[PDB]
Design a protein around this ligand. Structure first.
Ligand SMILES: CCCCCCCC/C=C\CCCCCCCC(=O)O[C@@H](COC(=O)CCCCCCCCCCCCCCC)COP(=O)([O-])OCC[N+](C)(C)C
Ligand SMILES: CCCCCCCC/C=C\CCCCCCCC(=O)O[C@@H](COC(=O)CCCCCCCCCCCCCCC)COP(=O)([O-])OCC[N+](C)(C)C
Ligand SMILES: CC(C)CCC[C@@H](C)[C@H]1CC[C@H]2[C@@H]3CC=C4C[C@@H](O)CC[C@]4(C)[C@H]3CC[C@]12C
Ligand SMILES: CC(C)CCC[C@@H](C)[C@H]1CC[C@H]2[C@@H]3CC=C4C[C@@H](O)CC[C@]4(C)[C@H]3CC[C@]12C
Ligand SMILES: CC(C)CCC[C@@H](C)[C@H]1CC[C@H]2[C@@H]3CC=C4C[C@@H](O)CC[C@]4(C)[C@H]3CC[C@]12C
Ligand SMILES: CC(C)CCC[C@@H](C)[C@H]1CC[C@H]2[C@@H]3CC=C4C[C@@H](O)CC[C@]4(C)[C@H]3CC[C@]12C
Ligand SMILES: CC(C)CCC[C@@H](C)[C@H]1CC[C@H]2[C@@H]3CC=C4C[C@@H](O)CC[C@]4(C)[C@H]3CC[C@]12C
Ligand SMILES: CC(C)CCC[C@@H](C)[C@H]1CC[C@H]2[C@@H]3CC=C4C[C@@H](O)CC[C@]4(C)[C@H]3CC[C@]12C
Ligand SMILES: CC(C)CCC[C@@H](C)[C@H]1CC[C@H]2[C@@H]3CC=C4C[C@@H](O)CC[C@]4(C)[C@H]3CC[C@]12C
Ligand SMILES: CC(C)CCC[C@@H](C)[C@H]1CC[C@H]2[C@@H]3CC=C4C[C@@H](O)CC[C@]4(C)[C@H]3CC[C@]12C
Ligand SMILES: CC(=O)N[C@@H]1[C@@H](O)[C@H](O)[C@@H](CO)O[C@H]1O
Ligand SMILES: CC(=O)N[C@@H]1[C@@H](O)[C@H](O)[C@@H](CO)O[C@H]1O
Ligand SMILES: [Zn+2]
Ligand SMILES: [Zn+2]
Lengths: 641, 641
């Protein structure tokens, strides 16, 4: 007797049986040709689980197999928080080639306990119109499934065949209104979501994406070429592990898109045209002077190690991106997929190509500074090398930001806007030293070390509850030191020094009060905002000093100052829309849903890139032009401030 | 009829049966109390597999279960290279708590083919004296198993219970003489080597180590505290995937050690005593002069960004080490485990603490240079800031090498000996400029950029077959440029310039010939050897120039030069023993078996650290002392070379 064979009718949805001690139940269901493409779920439940609360390990084992696919159920399934005494798994359906020939569904029940167990078997079939949904007609590139129910007892599965449907690139988006944790699972059609193929695998081809409100997966050309067929599953997650008592019903809307390679010619051309016409301010003055007109002692003492942090970070990020599998790239990278336009394997090509303004303006800065060089009695001190450094850091900002947008994740060094802080500090150094000497680029050494150290410190303490107090202390110390240096350099000449100190203290204290007690300022924005505000304040102080020392600001310099102020404000408005936070769960990071503002290509972050580049350009032009009224004044009669 | 039940005797080892089309075989074996702790293997074989060469997917499915554990067999199992029609898996044995009560072993056979299949079942029991071997008596800390057979049909498994055996720290070593690929697998005793627990796991607690000649796993205190029980398996690997036709027999010897926390007081004290007594050369001269005896203008223009590459690499490595699981740390890190002494979670504490000589000597360099400062008419030009830079890079070398030995892997930047190259270049700069001016530390900028770029370039092209030609081209270009600079600076004064150029060309060409056509020079050593050799050649040239210009080298400086030459040679001899190569397989990297040379604590690499630090110290002292015969000579009458 130990082995008991039962015959189960197809109509049966629920089976209740008692497993006598040391006995095995074998249940058979015959499958005809009506079971083709029928995705079946079999679940097992232990009746009266309270009696087995003192037993460790597996209390019931169930095996399910239809001949083509199989899995094992081990009850209870244990989770970090809970223990479930009911669980089930999906069986890959039989195909038309499988079919008086018939197929069998076999269920085996075993236990290690020397006591009778009551148990329940649930055989549920999924909606065969959510399976095989992914079939595209001629001229059809998008399909939508709206208001689909998701339950712990009824998951959702799709079959995708790219070879048969003529698909080279595929995108999938899920939308939900509730905050119920779910999972999006993808495997190649010949892989199992439950088992390992062999015991040495170390192959990562399975995607597991926890989500609440939004999930995105992109099948690139390379991945489709490798595998050609995929299965997609959605499950209710029993434990809110990657997101933050069940019986929830969760509604999900799907969006499936076939994609082709796209050359975003119109948006790129419009961006280049918009970025180019600002450069016409360089033509009438800087270039015309060039038209009208030891190097090794500065080439080997120029600080070139300032480029090392960005270049090493770029090498590290490229190494991390290239060795990752296709499946892991959708798990580890976080984009704003509502405004992400792909190009090849790159998920957000807009966020990368919109950094070209920094590259264009940095090279222009370098070339113009080198050419404009060339006298020692009249005018302010020239600033060739530090302007070259400002251009170099513009180029470094373009490289660092483009590298960041390949795969935005939580790493040791964020590196999306530190070069902007360096640029602001360098402009402050320029205006601080231009009337005493030729400004040196070793203040770049000190500034870069400070900026990178602050970036790392903010990153390391972000999870804690006192990181902003550390930032406020460092901010206070830096501003106090700068005020002390101003005092010592100029002396306590009432009008000049005292108002500078008071205004800088008030502005920085207002900022400190703001980001300490607002919570609308994210950690990734505080340092950049502080550097920009301090740079603008110092430039305004320099201009007011020029005015009240009875000097004249040229109308060209007033125009450039106004344009710089406007561009900085617009860039800051678009920067405020960032909303990036690595302290929340992956599902919360995936819930970002801001669409592209312009031409379906440009979003808030893309515009922040372009307008930050413009603000940098206009500020550079303003500081280049502001002291052009003193070109014939003698260096000994030039006022000092 | 479709379900057929068979009763199988315990004596049966082989079963041959025909699976008629659309039929299911259920085989039962009753288990008495004699099956306690009996690790059982069940394998399935498809007879005449040639008939199913045109069929895709799974042709036979087998489920095995003893009530407590279960698995699934799907035939054929496919591998990157081969397809196996015979495969089996291990079943976790029944325990004493499981036991007229009896247990059952159940085997189910199914197929999707509408044709009869012949198949064979093999039920093999493993050696129950290799299972439960890990039981330690009182006063016993090591156990050894010698000459154990490993076959594709008979794997090896061990059960480890740390709670019952009173184990806080455990080490396992495997030795083999043949090059047959195998796998070492470890899981917590409540985890499966075959299945995922739930479908959202992303938990890495399973170790898979490919090996040929040696494998090591270390159970730290933290891991044992989390899990308390583990199962260890060895398998023949069907495909030589992580290593480089079967029926091989592979012999393996095991070594199991209980470990306790150790304070290596005697070796550390001896190392500190050995490192300290060299410093007595500083006492009679440099410190006695201090006893007998703008800063902000150099503090803000000092290049501090030179510390950024090492500090950022250290932050990245610490982030990578801390977020890794216990299981992954044994998979991703490669030590010389024959000479690795643990401390806490650190696998090789000797390789980390032996870098303290660099830290001790760099701080001494900095302090002595700062204090010895302080005149402008007599003697050679003083070198305070560049000596401070040399000390700073000594400290950076200690940090970088200690960080490297936490987890030696194949990363973008190796960073075990670039700071040594920087130190050699800085000494060359010191001797190049000391008789013309005070040497500047911006040559550090150019030198550091070059060194880091060369390191990255060697790393990126290591897999290719022409990396050494790229290195040779860069070497030729650098040496030619240096010779040209020497010519231009000194002029073609026959005796001085021509012999310098000829000797440097000959030495560097000999080196280039060597590492191009020897293959005993590894990629990771070429640049370091070149920098050391060029530094020594330039110091010898400087000394010979002093001698042939009728100047005198003090006996103290001759002693320091001799000690520097001896220490560099000893350090190079120990450096030659490195044998690190990231182009080979992981098994080949794990086959390293060099034991500790001294006190069971110091190996070749540990001695390379100490003697490289000594060589640096002696070279620094020599260049500090060599021009002490010119202290009263006037700067205008000092010879130039
Ligand atoms: C470890 C964690 C990170 C730590 C660092 C974190 C911060 C990193 C940032 C910066 C690090 C460096 C800042 C400067 C340091 C003081 C230098 C100084 O005052 O002396 C110089 C002043 O020269 C200037 O002040 C020039 C302009 C500097 C602007 C750079 C900071 C911008 C403020 C950012 C806003 C706040 C930051 C936002 C915070 C959220 C020279 O003085 P002197 O006496 O004229 O020179 C002698 C010559 N003389 C006597 C003949 C004239
Ligand atoms: C992209 C891939 C990596 C590329 C970089 C890879 C290499 C990176 C390494 C180094 C990069 C920098 C090297 C120096 C470059 C030339 C500088 C020069 O000649 O001019 C200076 C010479 O001054 C010296 O030569 C000082 C000593 C320099 C030693 C540093 C290199 C050691 C050789 C390593 C052995 C070979 C390397 C081993 C290869 C396996 C100054 O010249 P001057 O004219 O006196 O100054 C003007 C003032 N005066 C006219 C008034 C006097
Ligand atoms: C020169 C200035 C404006 C900056 C460089 C921008 C130009 C040269 C870049 C930016 C966008 C680029 C294109 C982006 C997309 C396409 C389509 C596809 O086939 C890949 C390459 C191709 C054809 C690129 C060619 C080069 C390209 C046009
Ligand atoms: C400087 C300002 C005024 C204009 C600069 C010209 C820019 C906008 C031009 C120069 C080269 C051009 C590209 C040349 C080639 C490609 C690839 C092609 O498959 C689609 C068009 C596309 C993508 C063009 C886009 C526009 C482009 C980038
Ligand atoms: C921030 C940078 C880029 C822009 C600088 C803009 C310059 C041109 C602006 C900004 C602040 C301005 C000053 C603000 C207030 C006053 C007081 C009053 O007496 C009128 C002139 C005067 C003194 C302004 C002169 C022009 C001024 C200095
Ligand atoms: C020249 C710049 C850098 C200095 C001042 C920055 C200004 C322009 C920025 C910084 C903070 C920004 C504000 C932050 C919050 C709000 C509230 C909400 O309605 C969104 C926009 C709005 C109203 C922003 C408008 C622009 C803003 C005021
Ligand atoms: C001061 C100079 C010589 C360098 C510093 C070396 C000394 C201070 C270091 C190096 C080795 C270190 C010890 C290494 C091992 C032990 C045993 C264990 O309980 C952890 C800490 C402890 C107790 C450390 C204490 C500090 C220690 C003794
Ligand atoms: C400078 C030379 C001459 C001697 C320097 C003294 C060194 C060797 C001394 C100073 C502090 C000492 C350590 C102090 C504390 C510890 C932890 C203890 O559990 C074992 C001994 C151990 C690990 C000592 C090892 C030797 C030690 C590192
Ligand atoms: C490499 C550094 C650290 C050590 C330098 C060692 C010095 C003291 C050594 C190394 C090479 C030596 C020279 C080698 C050969 C000769 C030729 C002959 O006429 C004797 C003296 C003379 C000229 C030696 C003088 C001392 C010398 C300059
Ligand atoms: C002062 C230093 C840096 C310059 C010269 C380095 C010398 C001392 C080093 C570099 C290469 C080394 C040799 C490399 C290979 C061999 C062959 C084998 O039997 C091991 C040791 C031996 C014999 C080494 C002895 C020491 C050695 C000759
Ligand atoms: C299934 C489908 O719609 N896609 C097409 C199919 O219609 C077409 O006939 C075939 C050859 O063009 O390529 C694919
Ligand atoms: C199994 C074994 O040897 N280890 C010891 C056991 O003997 C000992 O009695 C117990 C209490 O000390 O700790 C454990
Ligand atoms: Zn950005
Ligand atoms: Zn080392």
């Amino acid at each position: 007797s130990s082995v008991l064979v039962f015959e189960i009718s197809s109509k049966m949805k629920m089976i209740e049986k008692k497993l006598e001690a040391n006995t095995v139940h074998v249940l058979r269901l015959e499958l005809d040709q009506s079971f083709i493409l029928d995705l079946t779920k079999v679940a097992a439940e232990i009746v009266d689980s309270s009696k087995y609360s003192k037993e460790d390990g597996v209390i019931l084992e169930v095996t399910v197999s239809n001949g083509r696919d199989s899995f094992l159920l081990k009850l209870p399934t244990v989770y970090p928080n809970l223990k479930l005494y009911t669980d089930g798994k999906l069986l890959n359906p039989l195909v038309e080639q499988d079919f008086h020939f018939h197929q069998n569904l076999i269920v085996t029940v075993q236990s290690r306990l020397n006591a009778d167990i009551d148990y329940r078997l649930h055989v549920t079939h999924l909606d065969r119109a959510q399976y095989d949904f992914l079939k595209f007609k001629t001229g059809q590139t998008t399909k939508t499934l709206s208001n689909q129910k998701l339950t712990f007892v009824k998951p959702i599965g799709f079959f995708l065949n790219c070879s048969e449907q003529n698909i080279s690139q595929f995108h999938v988006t899920l939308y939900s209104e509730d905050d119920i944790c779910a999972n999006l699972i993808t495997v190649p059609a010949n892989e199992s979501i439950y088992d390992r193929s062999v015991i040495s695998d170390k192959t990562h081809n399975r995607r597991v994406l926890s989500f609440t409100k939004r999930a995105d997966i992109f099948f690139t050309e390379t991945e489709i070429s490798m595998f050609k067929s995929f299965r997609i599953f959605v499950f209710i997650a029993p434990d809110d592990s990657g997101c933050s008592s069940f019986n929830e019903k969760k509604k999900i809307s799907f969006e499936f898109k076939k994609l082709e390679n796209q050359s975003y010619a119109v948006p790129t051309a419009l961006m280049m045209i918009f970025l180019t016409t600002p450069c016409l301010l360089f033509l009438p003055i800087v270039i015309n002077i060039i038209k009208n007109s030891s190097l090794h002692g500065q080439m080997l003492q120029y600080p070139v190690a300032i480029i090392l942090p960005v270049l090493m970070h770029t090498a590290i990020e490229f190494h991390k991106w290239t060795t990752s599998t296709m499946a892991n790239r959708d798990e580890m990278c976080f984009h704003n997929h509502a405004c992400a336009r792909p190009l090849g394997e790159l998920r957000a090509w807009n966020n990368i190509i919109t950094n070209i303004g920094y590259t264009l303006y940095g090279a222009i800065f370098i070339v113009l500074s080198i050419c404009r060089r060339g006298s020692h009695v009249f005018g302010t001190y020239e600033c060739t090398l530090l302007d070259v450094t400002i251009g170099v850091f513009m180029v470094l900002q373009s490289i660092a930001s483009a590298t960041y947008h390949i795969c935005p994740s939580d790493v040791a060094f964020q590196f999306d806007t530190p070069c902007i802080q360096v640029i602001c500090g360098l402009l402050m150094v320029r205006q601080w030293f231009v009337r005493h000497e030729s400004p040196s680029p070793a203040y770049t050494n000190i500034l870069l070390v400070g900026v990178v150290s602050l970036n790392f410190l903010i990153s390391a303490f972000s999870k804690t509850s006192y990181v902003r107090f550390i930032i406020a202390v460092i901010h206070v110390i830096v501003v106090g030191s700068i005020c002390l240096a101003k005092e010592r350099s100029l002396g306590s000449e009432k009008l000049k020094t005292r108002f500078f100190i008071m205004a800088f203290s008030m502005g920085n204290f207002a900022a400190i009060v703001m980001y300490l007690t607002l919570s609308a300022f994210h950690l990734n924005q505080i340092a950049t905002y502080c550097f920009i505000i301090n740079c603008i304040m110092y430039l305004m102080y320099y201009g007011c000093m020029k005015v009240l020392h009875s000097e004249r600001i040229t109308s060209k310099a007033k125009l450039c100052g106004a344009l710089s102020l406007l561009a900085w404000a617009v860039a800051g408005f678009f920067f405020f829309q960032d909303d990036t936070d690595w302290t929340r769960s992956a599902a919360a990071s995936r819930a970002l849903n801001k669409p592209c503002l312009l031409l379906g290509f440009f979003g808030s972050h893309d515009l922040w890139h372009i307008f930050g580049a413009l603000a940098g350009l206009f500020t550079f032009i303003f500081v280049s032009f502001v002291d052009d009224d003193l070109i014939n004044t003698r260096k000994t009669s030039i006022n000092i401030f």
